[PDB]
């Protein structure tokens, strides 16, 4: 919000150079003049014979402007032999990626071509250059001894780069190992030290690199993006990288340890071709000292409104937690074909509020696709998804869309002020723009009145207006303002006060000055520094008796204030800004002299009471809860009385009741901070006496883990009364947990069996199908469905195995569903390939681990009926009902407190056999 959008700096390279494709700050230790590094990957160069070799330019922000190209390399192509080129610098895109740390700056040519040392192959190895003291070295990590599509000849090393906090460069090349991709990291010191120009592949001690993997991982583009940050345990910066084509174009983000290439966590894209991984960023959004991962997926298509698909782009925000398991959230693009997550640049703390912040770019969004950058402030919770600022497009278009925001750099403060600044590159217009943060101001407004009360008989002060016995009071406002960073000393604010609120439209004005005879008043105030809260007093009087229509209403005195822009100072100019939310006005209120006695002052007796209906907690799955409340004041009128229901911090508020007509339809309010878990509802400033109110409040709640024993509500009324201004605290029991109805049921797919089967014969060694007969599947399913689960349970199946001397149903194979093991009796598998009541048992008991929150275990028993069995058996063909049965018992309810409920049930399945 405090980023100045009025007067940024605009830099430009030659036409067609894609000037702005890459940007970064340069912070040299020597000279006071800081610079900016702009990548111009297509720019024509002085390198002889090299066409569009590309370059990087350092740009001065302070005093004399424009830009000078950094000369890394003036050389053309070397020759392996006569008229036999060793390398190809033409269209090598030097400058596609530029990163700096302290005195060091790294720039890379990902399209850099290289002839083989033996064969004629010209391969896209990619190259980089590290400059530092004076000193320039060539760093060509992917240029190595194994060169081809299978090795790294296609790596295009330098496609993405980043420095670790320590001295070591992490570099991403997308093309290694059939575009599996590769990360390689090297100590910068090692690079400069061991570079020998007569050696085309230089041996580096302590270099870390991934290896070839199984061929499925081909074309996954590891190292498309890159970022550095500590995740595993502590210590060294560990490695983050986007692998956008991974998992059948689903995309992933791999994290490898900084010490070894062992990898710790993975993230994976939502749907294919969303290019999850296009951009990646690492920074601590919540200032919890745990780095948080951000992942751009600019091609994502969410679902809005009607349900129609739309590519908005999406950014992932993964908050690190000490447990090792992250806390991820999603952030969806606001416009179609914006490509929302295309660049994610941490800015650090732009407002110096104590939490780091970040800019996410949708370079193809906004009016005329001019490009937009959304800026989001960090908070204790995490990233605040409602963006505090949207930087819009500057340049419209020429040929390409400008892609404003296609590149960004932040967190490095380019000017003197204590706040970070941000560069966005728009290569489609060959431009780069520096946005500078303004210093932030937090003001603390004070207000106080001498007494609190209103009476015409309160007469005190005189007045030049007329003979005066009149009821006046003292009003004093005050401003203490401060902020970190450069604040130009003495800051002037124009404050304005109004004493009514229930007025000023016209008609009857309730409050007047004892000086300026006005409801309205201005004041040129001029505070300074961080201290010395500056105050100014004014005595204001009220209407007296007659001619006043008066009211019960307290008449709210409101004070507001604004900073002065035209009186402000800087080198060129920067107008400082107020705080984001530090409300720019305040309200107070007194009471009426009415009631209480003949005093205007009294002390009522406040009473609160409540009642439940049933109170059965769902164990935390979607449980509706309304409690009826009876609040009564047995004393006199309580001034500015309001209900404070203090509830457990995990629970949500549904709404006011508006159902039971004995309940209030009135004014309620949420408040989560000052560590308040309380809900606050307004009863009005002039509350009544002998009055009693009844209201219903519905909620919904989880109550995470093992806190189950009852539910506790605390509620209390509170007021501005001199004595007994608060009610006693009121408890409210709630009965903990509940039971559920779990049921088991089953079926046999051929529930019937018809007459004599064709092509049937019976012997005592008739292998498999013809003799065994047709397959009959019997699926049985036990399911826990309800707001409770079974931590342990017992299942007992009885299977009709044999009638008398013959095996009726022969079990071929058994199958399993869910967290359950089982064991049978009278073993099933034969030579390869009532009904059961009180009669020969084929019973199997099974032990299920848990059926949790609408979950179930299922046993599918497929059997064949044995012919032996199917012999006529004396009396001719009759109807048999083959019955199996399954019973259950639920074991170990969750909590000892409250009525743990016994659950019992059983099932039977039947197969009717007729001719």
């Amino acid at each position: 919000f405090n980023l100045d959008v009025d007067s940024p700096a605009e830099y430009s390279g030659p036409e067609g150079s894609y000037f702005g494709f890459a940007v970064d700050f340069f912070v040299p230790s020597a000279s006071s003049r800081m610079f900016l590094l702009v990548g111009a990957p297509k720019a024509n160069t002085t390198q002889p014979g090299i066409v569009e070799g590309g370059q990087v330019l350092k740009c001065d922000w302070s005093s004399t402007r424009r830009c000078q190209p950094i000369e890394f390399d003036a050389t053309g192509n070397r020759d392996y032999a006569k008229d036999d080129p060793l390398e190809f610098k033409s269209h090598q895109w030097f400058g596609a990626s530029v990163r700096s740390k302290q005195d060091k700056i790294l720039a890379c040519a990902p399209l850099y071509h290289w002839r083989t040392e033996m064969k004629q192959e010209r391969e896209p190895v990619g190259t980089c250059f590290l400059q530092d003291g004076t000193k320039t070295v060539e760093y060509a990590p992917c240029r190595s001894q194994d060169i081809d599509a299978d090795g790294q000849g296609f790596c295009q090393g330098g496609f993405s780069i980043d420095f670790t906090k320590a001295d070591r460069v992490l570099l991403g090349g997308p093309g290694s190992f059939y575009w599996q991709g590769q990360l390689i990291s090297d100590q910068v010191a090692e690079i400069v030290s061991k570079y020998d120009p007569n050696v085309y592949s230089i041996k580096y001690n302590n270099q870390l690199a991934t290896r070839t993997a199984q061929a499925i991982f081909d074309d996954s583009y590891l190292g498309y993006s890159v970022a550095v940050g500590d995740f595993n345990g502590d210590g060294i910066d560990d490695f983050v990288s986007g692998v956008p084509r991974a998992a059948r174009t689903l995309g992933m983000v791999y994290i490898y340890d900084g010490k070894n290439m062992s990898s710790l966590y993975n993230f994976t894209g939502e749907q294919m071709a969303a290019y999850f991984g296009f951009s990646v960023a690492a920074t601590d959004i919540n200032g919890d000292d745990y780095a948080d991962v951000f992942i751009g997926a600019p091609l994502f298509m969410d679902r809005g409104s009607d349900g129609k698909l739309q590519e908005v782009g999406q950014v992932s925000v993964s908050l690190q937690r000490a447990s090792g398991d992250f806390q991820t959230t999603k952030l969806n693009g606001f416009e179609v074909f914006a490509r929302f997550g295309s660049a994610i640049a941490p800015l650090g703390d732009l407002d110096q509020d104590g939490f780091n912040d970040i800019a996410i770019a949708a370079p193809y969004g906004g009016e005329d696709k001019k490009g937009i950058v959304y800026i989001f402030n960090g908070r204790s919770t995490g990233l605040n998804a409602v963006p505090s600022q949207i930087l819009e497009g500057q340049w419209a278009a020429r040929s390409m869309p400008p892609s404003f925001g296609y590149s960004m750099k932040g967190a490095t403060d380019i000017d003197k002020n204590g706040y970070p600044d941000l560069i966005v590159g728009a290569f489609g217009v060959d431009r780069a723009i520096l946005y500078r943060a303004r210093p932030v101001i937090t003001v603390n407004a004070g207000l106080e009145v001498y007494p609190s009360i209103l009476n015409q008989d309160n007469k005190t002060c005189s007045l030049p207006g007329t003979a005066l016995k009149v009821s006046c009071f003292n009003v004093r406002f005050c401003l203490k303002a401060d902020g970190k960073g450069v604040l130009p000393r003495k800051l002037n604010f124009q404050v304005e006060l109004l004493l009514d609120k229930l007025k000023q439209k016209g008609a009857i004005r309730r409050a007047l000055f004892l000086y300026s005879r006005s409801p309205s008043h201005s004041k040129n105030m001029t505070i300074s520094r961080g201290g010395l809260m500056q105050c100014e007093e004014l005595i204001a009087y009220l209407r007296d008796e007659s001619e006043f229509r008066d009211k019960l209403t307290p008449i709210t005195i409101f004070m507001e204030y604004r900073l002065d822009y035209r009186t402000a100072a800087d080198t060129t100019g920067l107008q400082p800004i107020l705080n984001q939310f530090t409300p720019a006005n305040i309200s107070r209120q007194a009471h009426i002299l009415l009631d209480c006695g003949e005093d205007n002052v009294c002390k009522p007796k406040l009473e609160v009471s409540v009642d439940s209906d049933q109170k059965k907690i769902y164990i935390g799955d979607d449980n509706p809860l309304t409690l009826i409340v009876k609040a009564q004041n047995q004393g006199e009128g309580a001034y500015e009385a309001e209900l404070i229901v203090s509830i457990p911090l995990q629970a949500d508020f549904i709404g006011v009741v508006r159902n039971n007509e004995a309940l209030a339809r009135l004014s309620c309010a949420f408040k989560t901070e000052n560590q308040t878990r309380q809900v606050v509802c307004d009863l009005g400033n002039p509350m009544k006496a002998g009055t009693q109110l009844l209201a219903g409040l519905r909620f919904s709640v989880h109550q995470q883990s093992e806190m189950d024993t009852s539910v506790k509500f605390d509620l209390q009324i509170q007021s501005s009364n001199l004595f007994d201004k608060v009610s006693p605290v009121v408890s409210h029991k709630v009965d903990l947990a509940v039971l559920a109805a779990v049921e088991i049921r089953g079926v046999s797919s051929p529930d019937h069996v018809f007459l004599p089967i064709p092509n049937w014969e019976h012997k005592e060694n008739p292998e498999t199908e013809e003799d065994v007969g047709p397959v009959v599947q019997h699926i049985y399913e036990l399911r826990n469905n309800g707001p409770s689960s079974f931590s342990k349970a017992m299942l007992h199946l009885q299977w009709p195995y044999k009638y008398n001397n013959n095996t009726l149903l022969y079990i071929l194979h058994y199958d399993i569903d869910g967290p359950m093991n089982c064991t049978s009796d009278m073993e099933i598998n034969p030579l390869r390939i009532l009904g059961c009541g009180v009669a020969q048992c084929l019973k199997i008991v099974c032990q299920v681990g848990r059926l949790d929150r609408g979950k179930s275990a299922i046993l599918y028993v497929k059997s064949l009926l044995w012919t032996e069995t199917f012999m006529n058996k004396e009396n001719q063909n009759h109807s048999y009902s083959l019955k199996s049965s399954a019973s259950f018992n639920v074991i170990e309810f969750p909590y000892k407190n409250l009525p743990i409920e016994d659950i019992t049930n059983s099932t039977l399945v039947t197969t009717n056999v007729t001719w």
Partner: antibody
């Protein structure tokens, strides 16, 4: 700080197949070519062939063809040259060599003295 | 393959002398020639590559002279650790062809 740690002396009866080891410490092994050189006692240097780790591709010398069996363990950064059916003219100090650019093997091993006798 | 001939196999010299080690290729190898110093205990360190280049820690005393066939390792002022057996090796084409080596003999 590059060290090529070889196997110790290897005495083996004629016909047998010894297999020497070469540990590559101090640079990235799988990215560099591995040459082997044979020095017979009081004799000159006979190049045996090279092996590229990773890909595993190995081009031997034709005078040593069907003698030198070159393998490479990229998970331990260790080259291996097996010698099948070793005769007494295979008595020699064998040298693994890290291959630099151009025409030159940079940073060598200590040597393995294989001796075929009865 | 092209044979590498060093015609002088034992060069006697004092400390400080100028030692020009000649080595001729059979066929023109277009200047890929490595010079290796094998100390008497047998460890072989690389001194020069591509007809003249110093490799890292090798001192400036080893002048790389050569072109075409005729090549020559020109040792500057001699010292004790410079007493060893110097091989040339043709690296241009395949299979790599070494020389006979030239033993630097301290003079008494």
């Amino acid at each position: 700080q590059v060290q090529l740690q070889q196997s110790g002396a290897e005495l083996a009866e004629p016909g047998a197949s010894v297999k020497m080891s070469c540990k590559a410490s101090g640079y990235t092994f799988s990215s560099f070519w591995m040459h082997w050189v044979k020095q017979r006692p009081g004799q000159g240097l006979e190049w045996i062939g090279y092996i590229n780790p990773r890909s595993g591709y190995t081009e031997c010398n034709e005078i040593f063809r069907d003698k030198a069996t070159m393998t490479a363990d990229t998970s331990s950064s260790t080259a291996y040259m097996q010698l099948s059916g070793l005769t007494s003219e295979d008595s020699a100090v064998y040298y693994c060599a890290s291959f630099l650019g151009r025409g030159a093997m940079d940073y060598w091993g200590q040597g393995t003295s294989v001796t075929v006798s009865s | 393959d092209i044979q590498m001939t060093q015609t002088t196999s034992s060069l006697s010299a004092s400390l400080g002398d100028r030692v020009i080690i000649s080595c001729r290729a059979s066929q023109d190898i277009s200047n890929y020639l490595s010079w290796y110093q094998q100390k008497p205990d047998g460890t072989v360190k690389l001194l020069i590559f591509y007809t003249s280049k110093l490799h890292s820690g090798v001192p400036s005393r080893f002048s790389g002279s050569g072109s075409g066939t005729d090549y020559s390792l020109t040792i500057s002022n001699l010292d004790q650790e410079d007493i060893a057996t110097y091989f040339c090796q043709q690296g241009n084409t395949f299979p790599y062809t070494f020389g006979g080596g030239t033993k630097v003999e301290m003079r008494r």
